[PDB]
Subunit: 488 residues, 4 copies
Amino acid sequence: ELKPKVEAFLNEEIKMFINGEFVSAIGGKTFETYNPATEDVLAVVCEAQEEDIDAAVKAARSAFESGPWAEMTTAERAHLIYKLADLIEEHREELAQLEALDNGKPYQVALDDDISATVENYRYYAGWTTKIIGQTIPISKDYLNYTRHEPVGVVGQIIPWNFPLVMSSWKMGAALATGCTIVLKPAEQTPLSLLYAAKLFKEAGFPNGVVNFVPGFGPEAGAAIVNHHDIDKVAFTGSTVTGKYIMRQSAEMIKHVTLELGGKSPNIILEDADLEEAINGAFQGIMYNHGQNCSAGSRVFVHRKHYETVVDALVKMANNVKLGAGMEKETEMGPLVSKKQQERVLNYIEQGKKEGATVAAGGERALEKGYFVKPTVFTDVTDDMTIVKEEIFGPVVVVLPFDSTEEVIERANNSSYGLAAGVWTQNIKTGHQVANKLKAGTVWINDYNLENAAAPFGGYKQSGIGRELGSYALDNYTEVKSVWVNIK
Amino acid sequence: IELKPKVEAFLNEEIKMFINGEFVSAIGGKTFETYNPATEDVLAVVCEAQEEDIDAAVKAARSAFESGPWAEMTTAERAHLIYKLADLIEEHREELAQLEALDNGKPYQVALDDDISATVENYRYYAGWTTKIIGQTIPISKDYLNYTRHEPVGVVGQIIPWNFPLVMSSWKMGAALATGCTIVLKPAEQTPLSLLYAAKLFKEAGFPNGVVNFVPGFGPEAGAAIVNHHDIDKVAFTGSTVTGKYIMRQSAEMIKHVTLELGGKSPNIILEDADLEEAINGAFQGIMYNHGQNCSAGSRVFVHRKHYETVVDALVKMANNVKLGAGMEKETEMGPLVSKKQQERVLNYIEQGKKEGATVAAGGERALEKGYFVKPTVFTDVTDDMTIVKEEIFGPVVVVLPFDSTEEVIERANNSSYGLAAGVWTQNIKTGHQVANKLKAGTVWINDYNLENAAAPFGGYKQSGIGRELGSYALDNYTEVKSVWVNIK
Amino acid sequence: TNIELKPKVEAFLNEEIKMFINGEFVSAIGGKTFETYNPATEDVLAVVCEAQEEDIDAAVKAARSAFESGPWAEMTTAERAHLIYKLADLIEEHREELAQLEALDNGKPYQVALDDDISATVENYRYYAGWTTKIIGQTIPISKDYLNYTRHEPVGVVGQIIPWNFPLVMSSWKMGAALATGCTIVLKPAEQTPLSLLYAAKLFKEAGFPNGVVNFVPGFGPEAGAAIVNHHDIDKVAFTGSTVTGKYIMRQSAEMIKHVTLELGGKSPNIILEDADLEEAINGAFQGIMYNHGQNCSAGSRVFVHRKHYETVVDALVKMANNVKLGAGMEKETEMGPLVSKKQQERVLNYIEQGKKEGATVAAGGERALEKGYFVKPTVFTDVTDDMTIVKEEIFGPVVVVLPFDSTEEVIERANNSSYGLAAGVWTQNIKTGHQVANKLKAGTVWINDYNLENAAAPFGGYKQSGIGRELGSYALDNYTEVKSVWVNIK
Amino acid sequence: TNIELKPKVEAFLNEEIKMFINGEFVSAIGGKTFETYNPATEDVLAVVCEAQEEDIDAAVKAARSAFESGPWAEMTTAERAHLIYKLADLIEEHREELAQLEALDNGKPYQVALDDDISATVENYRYYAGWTTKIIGQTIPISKDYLNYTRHEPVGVVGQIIPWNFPLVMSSWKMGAALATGCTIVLKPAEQTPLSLLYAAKLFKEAGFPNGVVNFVPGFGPEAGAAIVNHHDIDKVAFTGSTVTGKYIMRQSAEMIKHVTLELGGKSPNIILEDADLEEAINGAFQGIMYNHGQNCSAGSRVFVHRKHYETVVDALVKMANNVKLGAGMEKETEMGPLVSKKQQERVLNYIEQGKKEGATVAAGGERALEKGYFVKPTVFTDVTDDMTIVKEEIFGPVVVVLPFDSTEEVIERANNSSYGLAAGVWTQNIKTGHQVANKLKAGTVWINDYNLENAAAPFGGYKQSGIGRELGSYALDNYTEVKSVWVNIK
Ligand SMILES: NC(=O)C1=CN([C@@H]2O[C@H](COP(=O)(O)OP(=O)(O)OC[C@H]3O[C@@H](n4cnc5c(N)ncnc54)[C@H](OP(=O)(O)O)[C@@H]3O)[C@@H](O)[C@H]2O)C=CC1
Ligand code: NA
Ligand code: NA
Ligand code: NA
Ligand code: NA
Ligand code: NA
Ligand code: NA
Ligand code: NA
């Protein structure tokens, strides 16, 4: 049941946020975001067009070059971010509702995970503002040599629909900590939590233009950000094919890019694993957020000695999953985010059936309505298949037996992807050895799907370029200047 | 200057490629010619890497990265190999400086004192990094050990231009090799000699087979095969902004990390309170160093109105007094440009200048009987939207602009797609740092110009580059950060 | 015209001031109390519980327990960070109260306490709260056979002793860094200035610090102080004060092989070169020594002036000194309050007498001021030589010596010819001179065309006998940690 | 079977061993000399000039001048890096000669001196040579009004005292770091082991070090030693040795507010858990203590064993103990040499006697060995309790105590119940337990499924009474630096 501030918010046209003001599109167009558990329209939103992206970029450029954002001390900047975090925490329940409704995930996990992490991320990054240090370099008695880590300037950010608010925080936390200004676009299907959070940027005291939110569609608002001549740097998270596109376009202006694409991450259960823990880790690893997770462990490699114990257990778990609307207290898994996604993963499940794999559970849709799909366990698979090699992005897992550690490493690494990996073993040497050999940005030994503001994440190979979170994200938003002072 | 015996021996034969630790000819036998730009005579004939050879280099590098000594070796051991390489280059210093003078055209004494000495210092610097490329331990929670590993990216493909051939090979390889990567490297068709000579030293220093692979040839074939290679993990390139676009565009298809150092049109600013004597020398050397074939050349000298007339006079005199000649002639101060193609390209820029109405206060035409030479040139009476004021010429051509206020010169300096470097001349402590902070450029020299060192990073803002070379910074380009979480609950 | 007492201050002062141990406000085990005075009036400001050895022992046991188990030991770094953040928010909420206490107890002007001290306190906790999640060790690539990593672990129970010149802010320098690393604390404010800290204690409780993570033990140097210094179970010591007392602390710490951090005095030089911007340099020179009544480690107590400008600077510092409005801290027109105590006033008056005895000239001030309170007139000495006591020794009063010089090489040699090396300032418009002279001065901090600037992010401390180690900045964290190097065989 | 002397070693020993001060080899000012012995034969190995207080003064003046002016003060970081690298190349070229001196002078087996000590020396200089160009300070973004930056300056003239157990390699730990930062050195080798260092001195001269940058003063603790510790012009001190002497060094340093780095003893525990890999763990336990004849600060002198495995490990260590081939270092079959001196033999035999007196069982060894030279049989004590003197104190001989335990919580408590805290080893195949137990042990270094691993890149040092500070790694550089924070007003 709706919180009064959520009811109030949804009782009207959702404005975009530009130069510190809530505004309609210049051309006046609007679009609809739906509630995926019911298919009804949830809200009507102002539709950012190229001309609006261009007003936003002008606002961001002004805030970066002159005014309080440019003049502020690092402590002052830090306090703004810290105050933002406090405000988000205060509106925690309203934001969790907005995510549960717009995105579809269960309210309680949006609150406990998503919202909670957004808060922590902004607090972490506030801490960095006064610590982005450069170097003094002893080279010669004749010169003072030093580097300055300057903000890159105006940055364009594109956010997908699977962790809407949290992902906005990854991107913004680091960029704002360096002193940049932002032009950010949420996904067409999940613009609500961010647009609601814009009230909190204004209230925390952000100067006008520091952040600008332009909801809209990829090919118009999206592309306007990527192709914009006055945007200094771009960051994107999405499909590998759209990633290729952003990079291609960014080339035209020798523009730095940061991308986090998808994956087909392996979750490995070795013979000496703690089988109880590994099975729960294997199930959560794919099923968390309905499989709508870049780093989902969509390949559970299990040691031949435990294939059957595991495959059984995952089937019983997969059946037990209570599907429902996110705003229902008993819902464990919600629906996918859109009809397009629902089709897209149903078409993977069949494409896989037509390829010869068999279904130990799921493989269809769920409930009377909503963009739902049953949690699905595939069995009898081969490394060359479509469903083994490609990111499905639904709650579908392929389980593969193996007979040697050297084999599982080779097969785990035989992929164009390399976002993440899990390794379950109790042996100290094996766990480090294997994690060392896996070609992925993040490896969890005896766990899976753990993220924190302080630990970087991202892909090797076609899973991305660069890293998000940690100190590391900060380098994406900086231009290093080397100053030499002749003191001969 | 007389040829060294080891140079003579080297040029007395077909110049071979280096792949998998062996000197070899192109698989299909093709060869090409490199010239002596001061004479136009062929200097040597070289084996010509084709796509298939790049394929062989890449497989050798893949194998040396995945298994064998370079993969097993301690950081100390890798470091010592790199240190032994530097000692060897130092030993062959005179031979290498000769090759560079003959093949590139620059004067022998500066190749020795500058290029070859910097190459040695860069490898020594980077050897020191092997044992210090540290990751982090991150305290987050009592229930986990969190740590990062900075792993070498793998096989890296590198393309270097022709203006600082040996040194630029060192910028690239120093950092890559320090992280544990393996290299497929392509020198410019115009200047493959110093690199291919130096290959001997990689072998003798004890590099294992395939750790480094040198494939000379042409951009459209050898270059493209590197850029497009499915098994090359990361690429680095130095050159024109236009080819840079190409490289990044191509790298997109594989989600491949890029490092680029492109051109510039760097401002060199003389403020009113500058030590005008030192400023004049810095202005002149900032453009004329290496015949202007320098990314960071101070190609736009901005001069406070009060001093404009005075420094234009001096740069004109200095221009007209430089001794043009063959690099291997001891009286030479400036050699020719690198190729007929560059000589015409630059000449074309000067014509466009005159035609756009700028004045030629000095130079403006070719020099001597043969060779790709161009007279030092000073353009005057110029304006911000002129082709010559805005575009990288890459020859010994300067454009001199007067200005009236500091806010003005900052704005006009920054009004460019480029942002590689800048010079600021002032004796005031506040003005010098204030102006340096406001310039959009990777490197600013206060009361100096054109200084590089292994320890200080270099690169561009805007369309002058992505990423940095030199210093600790370069290392981040050759690494993949891995975050490991160990549940200890 | 009086600044009106804050109701919460009045309430605080209306009762015995308790100490803080294991999360509770308590009296001393033996019931002793001591008096703290208002140095402007000489009246008693409050009666405060006096910590004895037995009380330090109780605080150390509490701290030990909070470090070894309990929430502080189990909390994530984010959670520890949030505690620090909220404590800085509470400090800010009580900004006026805490500034009135500084003014009343220490003597300094209220507006300065507010704008400087309290605000710096707040920022210092905010800064350090940011470091909690960022205190990182290394992964070291050595060999394929081993995973090599280091951990920067909190050293443990830390003993901290704070002087009286910047009471609250000094407590924050000490505690912010240490708390950021996960340490637990036993801290002693100065006998003369225990109030601001004991009031602050309400705020540590309110923010939610677990029991015993911080422990405040007011009292005397020889009983409470020495008990901290000499305690078998305090893992590390931090101190700021006199160079003589510093020696004692290090000598005692030798017996347990205990890491020590110390910030001691100085005789910092403030150098005006020929090409200085004279108007800015005169103001810097005057504030450099007069700020906080000269009760400042880094005070530019030696003003070196290039021969050309010497007389011009002397005349200006004389006029400025004579124009200072002295008065109580809690009075709005006050620009410079009294010295912290009778003993300190007597100490500086003696130094002035020595200066006169030794042949120096009192160009201005040089005696006590007003009817009541520990006041001393801002003082300017001329006709001094390098071998004089007043030029070599820390006075810790609003007293300055002015010295002319003829060359840069000379001033650098004279500035460095001292046992001290806390700070220096250099005034010159020339880019090369600025940096060259900063490079040559043996001081932990050098201000070029400024003076007395401090920030949470920038380290502070002494060369030579001005100290060991640094406070503030990232640097201050390493004094609070032990480095553990872990080798994991992965062969 | 004797290892044949190298011509150069024979030529060196053929004469009086000179000291090295201001780039030249010279006699003591007062003509005094002392004898260093060969601990396997008890014969005099060489006569060496004995540095007095007057000699140390000469060395300090030389180092001071080298630090303040001349080539070392003007060299670029690359140039100073090159000197370090060349020195390492020279050490490598004389590897056999240096390993022979170590064996002869210290008594350790030649092959070990070679493969270990002398190769670690080389690598240690190569490592620190690489740091020369990378000792960076910070640019700190604080305000648009200022450029804030720090400089990590060399502290200056550093006094270094090194013991006799790893002569040459210890000199390298200390000088590598301190030389990388740009400091100058006054170093003293142990009375008993001056040869390898004085021989090495030729290499510093040959590598091209400027006059005075390194100065070697061999002699005695209470004369040459104390004079370093007490010199007014030495800016920092570093010492390795006994707790008791460490206390003295820190007490003396207090007088000048001088930074101290100390590595003292330990009683390190080597823990074998129930799921350990027993074969690996037994070898590691045995080597953990027997390496270098037990003359090792980090020696696993307390072998803790899980009850299940206690008797198996005891029998195994008894058998290995009695199988070691004792002999001269210069004899090819030698596995363990003598102790360094009659005095050290008398001390360890004393300890063994006390062990027997307090009720412990000598399961093996426990007496002297051979007919001449300072040998002691590898010894294994059982039937031991935590409060015995041999369990608590550092023996510094090839003596070990074996103790069973029944829970992991118990062994952490017993291992940590010590004033020492140098190192620990943990043997277990479980990923969780390894890290957990490593995290809870209070030791500077923890090896998981190994023991006695050292590397230039990894820090080493003690918690508690085992020391202050760290050596090796990037960390060791901080000990040789003074941090200067520069503020440039750019308003
Ligand atoms: N900042 C700098 O240091 C440099 C800037 N430039 C800029 O470029 C201008 C023209 O010179 P130009 O050499 O034509 O510039 P390009 O950018 O085309 O070439 C730069 C280098 O890249 C190689 N190359 C060319 N095409 C490809 C390709 N498709 N794939 C991979 N590699 C390729 C060339 O090899 P090859 O020589 O074999 O053809 C050359 O060594 C110069 O006047 C200057 O403005 C050029 C060089 C360096
Ligand atoms: Na929606
Ligand atoms: Na990639
Ligand atoms: Na050529
Ligand atoms: Na008081
Ligand atoms: Na000191
Ligand atoms: Na001896
Ligand atoms: Na200690």
